[PDB]
Structure formats: C-alpha cells, structure tokens
Amino acid sequence: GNIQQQIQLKSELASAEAKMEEQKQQLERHFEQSANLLENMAEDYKKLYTHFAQNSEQLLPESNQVE
Amino acid sequence: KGNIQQQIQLKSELASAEAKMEEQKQQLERHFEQSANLLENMAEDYKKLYTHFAQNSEQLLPESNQVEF
Amino acid sequence: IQQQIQLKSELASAEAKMEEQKQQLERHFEQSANLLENMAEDYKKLYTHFAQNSEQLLPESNQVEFFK
Amino acid sequence: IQQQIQLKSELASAEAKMEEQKQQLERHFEQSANLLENMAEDYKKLYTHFAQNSEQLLPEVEFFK
C-alpha cells in the first residue's frame, strides 16, 4: 500500500508511543518507591550505628577506639 | 514534506521507537538482576549481624532472659 | 588478722559493678533487637517491591531466581 | 586465719571475671562495628545502582544525584 501503509504506520506509532509513555509512568512509580525505601534503611541503619557508638561508652576510651 | 517523505520518516521513527523499547527492555532485565544480587548481599549481611547478636546475647547474659533471639 | 573488712567490701563492690554492667548489657541487647528488627522489616518491604515491580514491569522470561 | 585465704581468692576470681567479661564485651563490639560496615558497604552499592539506573532509564530522580 501507498496510503494503507501510511494509515498503518501512524497507528502502530501511536500504540508504540503510548506503551513507552505509561511504562515510563511506572518506571518512575518504581524509582520513587525505591529511593525513599532506601532512605528508610539508611535511617534504620544510621541509628543502629549510633546505638553501637553510644553503648561504646561501655568501655575504657582505650579498649574501644574503633571506629 | 509530502507523502513519500512523510512515509519514509514514519518508517524511521517506528523503527527508532521499536529499537528504543527493546533497549529499555534489556536494561530493565539488567536492573532487576543486578538488584536481586545486591539485595541478597544485604540479606546475607543482616544474617551475619543478626546471629552475631543471637549468640552474644545468650552468651553474655546466661541467667538473664532472651527476647526472641 | 583483721584486714578482712577490706576484702569483704572489695567483694561486695566489684560484685556490684558486675551487677550494673549486667544491667547495661541487658539494655544494650534488648534495644539492639528492636533496632535490628526494624532493618529486617525495611528489607522485606524493599524486597517485595522489587518482586512486584520485577514482574509488573517485565515479561515472564526474566524469572530471576531471587524473586519467588 | 584460713578465710583470709578463702576471701583473697574469691576477690581474684571476681576481679578476673569482671575482666574477662570486659574483653568479651570488647570483642563483641569489634565484630559488630565491622558487621554493619559490611551492611553499609552493601547499602552504598544498592543505592548507586539505583542512581545509575534511574538516571539512565528516565528523564526527570528525586533522591539521587
């Protein structure tokens, strides 16, 4: 076809483009849930670390210098 | 512009969209595979930090009671 | 011989220290637990997320072993 | 008399155990402080794999930089 080929393309390019677009919608629903779930663990860690550095006063300042 | 020009371009941006979509597909497959790796890493290091506590609590507090450990 | 008062007090005292360092080791582990158990629960949250988005965003052909 | 000898050894027994308890509690910290610096190692990896896979997969993201 010369114009059936054309009305075909425009319709597989609108369907292609719509898949990309809203699969883009959920890739960013992914990296948004991802990033702050890390910020959960990074804060659950950063206070598990502090609990250890503070119960580090449970020794002489010589017998535990690390970290 | 015209009808043969506007055709050979659709032909290019449909191929460029199909190539883009397959690229995007095998770099999701890359992301969830290199994520499943680093996450199990995270788990097997927890199971280090957890059982280093599971024993040092029942081993430095003998008479004392235990919370789940 | 009556430097026995001193011995019997050094023994009530050093023994008290160990009774208080036993208070602190009970504290340290009981809130090392709930602080640990937090991390644990962030993990299987951040884990299952990468199990849903690993199959709600991806064909059936990448059955990455790690996810159920 | 002879219990100036039972006490003197009871002290040495308390004093050495108060002591071995201190360097077991010491070894319990050396091994913790290096086991969450394994988990800190893991975290940094997982995060930069999200930064370098949210930037390379999308246009504009929030946390990463």
Swiss-Prot record, chain A:
Keyword flag Membrane: yes
Record's keyword annotation contains Cell cycle: yes
Subcellular location: Cell inner membrane
GO cellular component annotations of the record: plasma membrane
Membrane topology designation: Single-pass membrane protein
Record key words, sorted: Cell cycle, Cell division, Cell inner membrane, Cell membrane, Cell shape, Coiled coil, Membrane, Transmembrane, Transmembrane helix
Location, primary (coarse class): membrane
Domain note: The tetrameric alpha-helical coiled-coil structure is likely to be involved in linking the Z-ring to the septal peptidoglycan-synthesizing complexes.
Similarity comment: Belongs to the ZapG family.
Oligomer status and interactors: Homotetramer. In solution, is primarily monomeric but forms small amounts of stable tetramer and hexadecamer. The crystal structure of the cytosolic region shows a coiled-coil tetramer in the asymmetric unit that is very likely to be a physiologically relevant assembly of the protein.
Name of protein: Z-ring associated protein G
Gene: zapG
